[PDB]
Amino acid sequence: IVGGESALPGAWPWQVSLHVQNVHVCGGSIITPEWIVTAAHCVEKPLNNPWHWTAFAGILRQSFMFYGAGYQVEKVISHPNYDSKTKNNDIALMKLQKPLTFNDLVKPVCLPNPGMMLQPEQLCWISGWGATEEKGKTSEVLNAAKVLLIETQRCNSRYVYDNLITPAMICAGFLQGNVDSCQGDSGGPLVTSKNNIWWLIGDTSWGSGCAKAYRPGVYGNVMVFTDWIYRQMRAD
Amino acid sequence: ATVHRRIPDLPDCDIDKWLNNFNVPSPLNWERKIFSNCNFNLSTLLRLVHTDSFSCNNFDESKIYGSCFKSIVLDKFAIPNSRRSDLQLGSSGFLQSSNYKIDTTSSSCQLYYSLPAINVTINNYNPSSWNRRYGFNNFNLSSHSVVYSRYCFSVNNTFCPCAKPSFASSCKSHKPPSASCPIGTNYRSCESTTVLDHTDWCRCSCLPDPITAYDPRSCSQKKSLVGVGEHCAGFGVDEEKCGVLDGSYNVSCLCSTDAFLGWSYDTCVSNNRCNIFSNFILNGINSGTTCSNDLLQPNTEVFTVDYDLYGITGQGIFKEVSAVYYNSWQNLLYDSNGNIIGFKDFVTNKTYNI
Amino acid sequence: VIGDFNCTNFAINDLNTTVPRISEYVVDVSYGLGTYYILDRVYLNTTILFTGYFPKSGANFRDLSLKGTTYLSTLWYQKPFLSDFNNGIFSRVKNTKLYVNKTLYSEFSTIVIGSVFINNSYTIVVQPHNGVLEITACQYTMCEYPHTICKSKGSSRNESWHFDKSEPLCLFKKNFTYNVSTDWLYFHFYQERGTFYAYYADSGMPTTFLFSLYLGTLLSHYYVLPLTCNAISSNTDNETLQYWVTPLSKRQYLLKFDNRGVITNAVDCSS
């Protein structure tokens, strides 16, 4: 996250950091104590294995992160309609062995019900352990910032993205730049405030550059995939 | 009854001749002329030039009758029929923001007048150095039509609406036009980016246009407002329509006529007449040589007493006779011993005896 | 140095090669030469005793004509070329004629009259333009080294005697015309009680009134601007510039008028 302020403890109690090879790689979102939502392209082969994945929850800083964290990750479920060359249906589900005990600073996000009347230019927040420079090095604490939602037809113009936005994706950020996501922010939760309730509407999938004009961030639309999440939850 | 004749020392201003000129400039080409060291009659000027309204800012119209000024500055231009309300004292209109702003910090008078449109021709011209440099020409729209600017943009002496042919050649997607730029400038900022699959995505600046640009901080030409006494810096230029594709550095960078944006035109014909605006700038009150003669006694007819003839005062009678001894420089006839006996009127060429 | 504005520095040398010559012509007021008509007055067949500013009978003239080619000397802008305007001067001017493709052109030297020649005072300038005569008497920012150029067969320098972007505050302005085929021209200039008077004539006749101007300040210095040309030299045309000046004083004259107002004879009364 470029141009963002540090988040105080107990602000976004849903940032789940996935640790592979004893180091954090991608983030995630917790909706139920038995499932975590993140991107599917990072869980691709050969990383598509139930083991070799450690989930750390409630860690407000990378200093406290060490040996000893949440239970082992169960079998990871990805969207079968996903592709590699063409970005589409980038959603993955990871289950935990032990249930996620709701601590003081722990609260799952609410899934958006079909039908919400989203404002074309609505305020939303992005949070994750990213960078603030040329591909950066790493992040030691939480970093969050607010962004706006970009309309689909305007984002799909010939000067932004020439027919590269599927109906299952949304654009967020500022067209002027200086505020956007960067590398390493895979699975960054995109939350919005509606009727004093926070909802998850986006999932960081891909982009171009970091905090540069004419290149906004691309987020996966969870509204279309809400049916697949419920189907997987009912099957499991 | 009284007769007062005097030879003027300063010529007439002839303001009506310049105001009634048949070459009416557009608001984009507002002309300025400085009148100084001359005499004028204000009411005669307002009568000869058909005036619709006359008001003064920070100054009283009654005080103009009989005052002297150092110099008077006049600015005139035609009024479009659609934007006549933008000439109000203080307004965020296109006229006062792009063509000519009225100064509200000094004593100025505004005049609205008309002229028969059977003889009126509008002279449209672009007072932009950088726009004329890259291939601008005459408007060629219609007669009795005036052009007013809507957005004003300014650049430095480094702008060139052209991309580098070397950088534009290595672009397999969204190739911008490129051509040869004159000696000493800065080429258009274009950089190649990499996307998910395409590794030849070339992006440039000032997109899509400077009027509706997404990021003004990344475009060279910046929007500016006209000051007090300055013209429009120039119209907007669409960089996507300038130059040609794949030029081997052997072609100039001339934009098409459709590449210039930010200007509109409208007619000025109303009741077989054209409407013209004029602004008077007064410099120096109660001091100067540009005075008004509306408080002086007019040169009335000579009733053939109480006369003031070329600096000589007295009382007597007059009788119209013929006289051939008067030369070009002679006006008064004196007797053998210092007494005036005859004179000549320099407005009717009639000789009288006293 | 006459002015104070550094308006041009092209070629300013320092050489002493000019001295005013004393003319062999003697003032003779018997037939009218040296006398002027009153400002606006007509007299028919009378004899008048008039006390005014007239030149003295039996006086010599001094030439103040300066001609150069792309060079200006500093000594030209000092004494005795910058004379004192005590009461007035009577000047006889020679009309120099030039032919360009058998077309006659007339030009002679211009004279400037002032006190300090700065833009806080009024300075009187008389300059001819091929048949028309212009008088300014304005507040001009005079160059420190002024000069005049010839329009026909132009010189190397440019006409630069004042630097004013806009027209300054002037008290008088008018144009007069003269005969182009004449060979001698006469002038009268003098001041009395803060008023300035000017006279001129095309032929060997009494001069004609020009104008009157009330200033209130005493004019003390007059100067003749040098003329730069490439044809008036003694190498191609064998022509010369001549501008003689004699001092004026308050004397008494006896004027004779005919039945039509023409001056016939004049007596100096002190010769």
Ligand SMILES: *[C@@H]1O[C@H](CO)[C@@H](O[C@@H]2O[C@H](CO)[C@@H](O[C@@H]3O[C@H](CO)[C@@H](O)[C@H](O[C@H]4O[C@H](CO)[C@@H](O)[C@H](O)[C@@H]4O)[C@@H]3O)[C@H](O)[C@H]2NC(C)=O)[C@H](O)[C@H]1NC(C)=O
């Ligand atoms: C009335 O007359 C006075 C005469 O003194 C006149 O004042 C002069 O004005 C000029 C023009 O502004 C002054 O000249 C300038 O002087 C400054 C120093 O004060 C210099 O730095 C300037 O140099 C610039 O211009 C040069 C070319 O001329 C360049 O080579 C140089 O690099 C600089 O860019 C310039 O010489 C002059 O100093 C004054 N004189 C005095 C005594 O103040 C006044 O302006 C006149 N009034 C009107 C209304 O015209």
Ligand SMILES: *[C@@H]1O[C@H](CO)[C@@H](O[C@@H]2O[C@H](CO)[C@@H](O[C@@H]3O[C@H](CO)[C@@H](O)[C@H](O[C@H]4O[C@H](CO)[C@@H](O)[C@H](O)[C@@H]4O)[C@@H]3O)[C@H](O)[C@H]2NC(C)=O)[C@H](O)[C@H]1NC(C)=O
């Ligand atoms: C007394 O006589 C002198 C000399 O004869 C005279 O000076 C002349 O005045 C005229 C009128 O102002 C000058 O002519 C102007 O010259 C300038 C260049 O210096 C031109 O730019 C002017 O162009 C105007 O007129 C054009 C139409 O002809 C327009 O299209 C244009 O837009 C301008 O409005 C104009 O031609 C002339 O240069 C001077 N000459 C000299 C030697 O100074 C003076 O005016 C006379 N005095 C009186 C009271 O008549």
Ligand SMILES: *[C@@H]1O[C@H](CO)[C@@H](O[C@@H]2O[C@H](CO)[C@@H](O[C@@H]3O[C@H](CO)[C@@H](O)[C@H](O)[C@@H]3O)[C@H](O)[C@H]2NC(C)=O)[C@H](O)[C@H]1NC(C)=O
């Ligand atoms: C300068 O121009 C003005 C305007 O033309 C001259 O003043 C005008 O003089 C005439 C003649 O006296 C006035 O006419 C009179 O009008 C009244 C009605 O207003 C009428 O009742 C009378 O019978 C007479 O016709 C005219 O009003 C007057 N204009 C103004 C504005 O007062 C003036 O003489 C000119 N000055 C010079 C020096 O030329």
Ligand SMILES: *[C@@H]1O[C@H](CO)[C@@H](O[C@@H]2O[C@H](CO)[C@@H](O[C@@H]3O[C@H](CO)[C@@H](O)[C@H](O)[C@@H]3O)[C@H](O)[C@H]2NC(C)=O)[C@H](O)[C@H]1NC(C)=O
């Ligand atoms: C402008 O000045 C010239 C030069 O003085 C005037 O021309 C001169 O005119 C007079 C009058 O005609 C000429 O005098 C006559 O000359 C003829 C010979 O041509 C002689 O036979 C007569 O007896 C008489 O003397 C004079 O020669 C002539 N000078 C020249 C050089 O041609 C001219 O008239 C003046 N302009 C005006 C409008 O007066």
Ligand SMILES: *[C@@H]1O[C@H](CO)[C@@H](O[C@@H]2O[C@H](CO)[C@@H](O)[C@H](O)[C@H]2NC(C)=O)[C@H](O)[C@H]1NC(C)=O
């Ligand atoms: C500009 O105005 C003048 C004078 O009002 C017009 O000249 C007149 O033209 C008509 C018809 O052409 C003639 O019958 C008159 O005799 C003309 N009068 C004079 C004084 O010349 C002129 O036509 C007008 N300009 C245009 C383009 O119509």
Ligand SMILES: *[C@@H]1O[C@H](CO)[C@@H](O[C@@H]2O[C@H](CO)[C@@H](O)[C@H](O)[C@H]2NC(C)=O)[C@H](O)[C@H]1NC(C)=O
């Ligand atoms: C009064 O007489 C003078 C003297 O002739 C006239 O002035 C002349 O006018 C004609 C025509 O305009 C010009 O060609 C001459 O050049 C003028 N001469 C001078 C010396 O100025 C004047 O026009 C006459 N006024 C009237 C009303 O008839």
Ligand SMILES: *[C@@H]1O[C@H](CO)[C@@H](O[C@@H]2O[C@H](CO)[C@@H](O)[C@H](O)[C@H]2NC(C)=O)[C@H](O)[C@H]1NC(C)=O
């Ligand atoms: C006389 O005036 C002319 C016209 O301004 C001068 O010519 C200019 O000279 C400068 C200096 O080299 C050039 O930059 C201009 O382009 C010239 N202008 C034109 C129209 O040619 C000339 O130098 C002046 N002469 C003097 C002696 O000062």
Ligand SMILES: *[C@@H]1O[C@H](CO)[C@@H](O[C@@H]2O[C@H](CO)[C@@H](O)[C@H](O)[C@H]2NC(C)=O)[C@H](O)[C@H]1NC(C)=O
């Ligand atoms: C100006 O006058 C001089 C003096 O008369 C002329 O010089 C004479 O020229 C002729 C022909 O070349 C010679 O035969 C004489 O010997 C020269 N005299 C002297 C004293 O040098 C000169 O030619 C005249 N200028 C012109 C342009 O004709």
Ligand SMILES: CO[C@]1(C(=O)O)C[C@H](O)[C@@H](NC(C)=O)[C@H]([C@H](O)[C@H](O)COC(C)=O)O1
């Ligand atoms: C023939 O020389 C002229 C000329 O070229 O027509 C004539 C004359 O010798 C001279 N003029 C004056 C008034 O002194 C004038 C100059 O005196 C000289 O040329 C030298 O100039 C200076 C300033 O030293 O030169």
Ligand SMILES: *[C@@H]1O[C@H](CO)[C@@H](O)[C@H](O)[C@H]1NC(C)=O
């Ligand atoms: C002016 O425009 C008209 C109509 O578009 C065209 O016929 C004419 O050739 C143009 N003239 C010039 C000089 O551009």
Ligand SMILES: *[C@@H]1O[C@H](CO)[C@@H](O)[C@H](O)[C@H]1NC(C)=O
């Ligand atoms: C520029 O050079 C290229 C390559 O030699 C050539 O094809 C093209 O016609 C040239 N253009 C001009 C205007 O000379």
Ligand SMILES: *[C@@H]1O[C@H](CO)[C@@H](O)[C@H](O)[C@H]1NC(C)=O
């Ligand atoms: C006059 O000005 C010129 C150019 O600005 C300069 O070269 C010269 O030294 C100046 N002379 C004086 C005496 O100021």
Ligand SMILES: *[C@@H]1O[C@H](CO)[C@@H](O)[C@H](O)[C@H]1NC(C)=O
């Ligand atoms: C110039 O030279 C003449 C001739 O000798 C001489 O009379 C005069 O005094 C000189 N002028 C100066 C200023 O030295």
